[PDB]
């Protein structure tokens, strides 16, 4: 029931091959066991059985970045928890409330970000990303020469 | 520790070991980010879609702590959506898979009759 | 490298949300670890990371029927091995060589098929299917009243 | 028992236990039907596609007997396709994933230099 089955119908198989196949497909439908009784598909002319479940995907950018870095470390941090709960929540406003952004980003680069060391962790990068989006002039004055990886990312991301 | 988390950890199902793939690790990170940013409500159709194809949020046979964390905010939202609906059959269809999951979770955590979602 | 990644570009997210997201996406590209360096997709206006591998599917009718019956029994049979290697091979001819079909199907209902008992196994059904496609008049005379499941399948399969 | 099957079972990799899912059971049944019906050659692009996304035929980390059974008929076919090509680079692209698999399998089973596929 997340399965689609179809008949051999077209395909230039010979008529007798279509019959053998379609008798087998019809018999799978009849002898199917209720919990695996597939749905039939009529705009496929080719015979197959296929799982229609969604493939692996992520819609959250933090999760995407952590996945591609295999970096699941530091999610319990105050650093990360502030990133998520104090900064990233602000990004869902239609218009940014600038006075609050100003202190929260200030605070971010006071307590949590000082560095752009590296090796840069996903947690560091997610914090930097959120602060940059909210207050990049504070970033410019904070780190006027950025790690080149971060620099190349920003150069790409900044144009619409 | 909230009342629901405390209840969950009182059950041995909370003790079932599971070694996450990196895919499951990402699914857990994704719902943490949705939770802590306060965006569960705009992501209900995404939750409903995940639960169409997965019994639990992080692609597991057993509820995990992600399920309890999300159910904690999701139950009140869905209950309100249902209580206020002028066509509860359609609402039920729209959120069919979240409602299956809610039913299980509110029974597992023995949610009180005032706080639970009266089901059909 | 069986992964597609895309930017938040459209979406009516606010401009600052697109930026936060797209900085994160750009940073995943830069900090990706060679063995997981995804390909970018430009006709998706929505941000995601997704596995592009094919989903579970079967193209062989015998395998489809066995899967939907959870019946993997008897593949070592002479019954099944004759079905596969003596009958099913003939179905790939552009035109059927009728004299050979005649004896091989005769033999099939001599040695291997007698019954349409049941419970009918996938092996039985796959043998019946192949013989029917090749020589259904021999079947009509062999079993003039078919199990109703098989009967319903045949009724569907016989029309183009 | 063919020479290749006999060789395979002389290696301990043939002894690695694996409990097939019903999906993997179907994949094995599907290639058995393709083999015994004599249709490997028309199903080469299908084999190539399976092997794009799977290291081995039945979605395993280790070669199984299905791999050895199919490699037995597939090696001669692909070798002939390559030996006769007027543009071997294109042939290599068209059958790229089968060639990766062949390379592994002909090394594992220590196929003789006359019978193996001279690789690039």
UniProtKB/Swiss-Prot annotation, chains A, C:
A GO-annotated cellular component: methionyl glutamyl tRNA synthetase complex
GO molecular function term, any single one: methionine-tRNA ligase activity
Chain positions found as N-acetylserine: 2
Top-level taxon: Eukaryota
Recorded family membership: Belongs to the class-I aminoacyl-tRNA synthetase family.
Other information: Present with 85000 molecules/cell in log phase SD medium.
Subunit structure: Component of a yeast aminoacyl-tRNA synthase (aaRS) complex formed by methionyl-tRNA synthase MES1, glutamyl-tRNA synthase GUS1 and the tRNA aminoacylation cofactor ARC1 in a stoichiometric complex. Interacts (via N-ter) with ARC1 (via N-ter). Can also form a stable binary complex with ARC1 that is functional in terms of aminoacylation. ARC1 increases the affinity for cognate tRNAs due to the presence of a tRNA binding domain in the middle and C-terminal part of ARC1.
Function: Catalyzes the attachment of methionine to tRNA(Met) in a two-step reaction: methionine is first activated by ATP to form Met-AMP and then transferred to the acceptor end of tRNA(Met).
Protein name: Methionine--tRNA ligase, cytoplasmic
Native species: Saccharomyces cerevisiae (strain ATCC 204508 / S288c) (Baker's yeast)
From Swiss-Prot, chains B, D:
Region (Interaction with glutamyl-tRNA synthetase GUS1) residue spans: 52-61, 91-120
Subcellular location: Cytoplasm
Region feature (Interaction with methionyl-tRNA synthetase MES1): 22-46
Coiled-coil annotated residue ranges, if any: none
Complex and partners: Component of a yeast aminoacyl-tRNA synthase (aaRS) complex formed by methionyl-tRNA synthase MES1, glutamyl-tRNA synthase GUS1 and the tRNA aminoacylation cofactor ARC1 in a stoichiometric complex. Interacts (via N-ter) with MES1 (via N-ter) and GUS1 (via N-ter). Can also form a stable binary complex with either MES1 or GUS1 that is functional in terms of aminoacylation.
Miscellaneous field: Present with 57700 molecules/cell in log phase SD medium.
Role played: Binds to tRNA and functions as a cofactor for the methionyl-tRNA synthetase (MetRS) and glutamyl-tRNA synthetase (GluRS). Forms a complex with MetRS and GluRS and increases their affinity for cognate tRNAs due to the presence of a tRNA binding domain in its middle and C-terminal part. Binds specifically G4 quadruplex nucleic acid structures (these are four-stranded right-handed helices, stabilized by guanine base quartets). Also required for cytoplasmic confinement of the synthetases and tRNA.
Family: Belongs to the tRNA-aminoacylation cofactor ARC1 family.
Annotated protein name in UniProt: tRNA-aminoacylation cofactor ARC1
